[model samples]
Target: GGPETLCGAELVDALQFVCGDRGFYFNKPTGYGSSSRRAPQTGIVDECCFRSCDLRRLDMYCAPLKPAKSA
Candidate 1:
């Protein structure tokens, strides 16, 4: 059983619409080689910079209540 949708069936449906379990978030493989670098961030956003050979899954979320960037 599930809620039947994502972004509470609102937010995600608005942006890119990758309807699933994830909303306003995605995985990006751009990491460093065992890289030890971080971005300055907090609630709604984080600073996980990208590097070489890294499993860089930078997830910047808790963003605006609306789509600020292009879908």
Candidate 2:
């Protein structure tokens, strides 16, 4: 309900700065989880961090390079 917001331009700027291909994701609930959560929490709950979101509010940042291998 309170996910961060960013337009096409905003996302572009973010990608340029985060250039490491590190932690970054998108979702409706805005709880973009990753392997790293900084021990319980990063203690940095702030906007401009897209969590629960809508496609209309975001842009294409990444694409699946390869499919997951079967076990």
Candidate 3:
């Protein structure tokens, strides 16, 4: 996976602990949306932004890790 597409498990787990079970729109883009036409972005839920996630608030729009598939 690309660097941007993968995040540390520590960070991911932390977010889950704090945010609890929430919606993960893996097939859909997750990011701030603008009223005007704009491209969606896969939100960066990295160490830089992980600290901001809380029980009721998340600094960045996030999507849980996409599961790896096997044939």
Candidate 4:
């Protein structure tokens, strides 16, 4: 079992504590309809911008350390 948590900015602080300085990525999806013209929106922090080098990696862990809690 995991420890009970803290709130406020401590959540983001905890994620940075675990993942270190590694970067992340997001991509635009392809299709044949209106969806093709639309970009996929991810809920990640704005500071984690997609980088050119991130094209090769498929997925990243933004979890456990950054558990999504309902307000």
Q: Point out where model 3 deviates above 4 Å.
A: 1-7, 21-27, 30-40, 44-71
- lDDT per residue (tens digit) for residues 1-71 in model 4: 21444333654564455556663333334446775455433333322233221311222543223537965
Tell me the tens digit of each residue's lDDT in model 3 across 2-58: 443324675566556544575332223433456322532234354224333343344
Per TM-score, the best of the predicted structures is: 3
Global lDDT of model 3: 0.43
Candidate 2 ranges with C-alpha deviation above 4 Å: 1-3, 20-71
Clashes of 3: 0
Q: Report the Cα RMSD per candidate.
A: 12.6, 11.7, 11.3, 14.2
TM for candidate 4 is 0.28
Pick by lDDT: 2 or 4, better one: 2
Candidate 4 backbone collisions, by pair: none
The C-alpha lDDT values of all candidates are: 0.33, 0.41, 0.43, 0.39
Q: Name every residue pair that clashes in candidate 1.
A: 31-51, 32-51, 32-52, 39-47
2 or 4, which is superior by TM-score? 4
* TM-scores of all predicted structures: 0.19, 0.24, 0.31, 0.28
Count of clashes in candidate 2: 6
The superposed Cα distance between candidate 4 and the true structure at residue 31, in angstroms, equals 13
Q: For model 2, which pairs clash?
A: 27-53, 28-52, 28-53, 29-52, 30-51, 30-52
TM-score of 1: 0.19
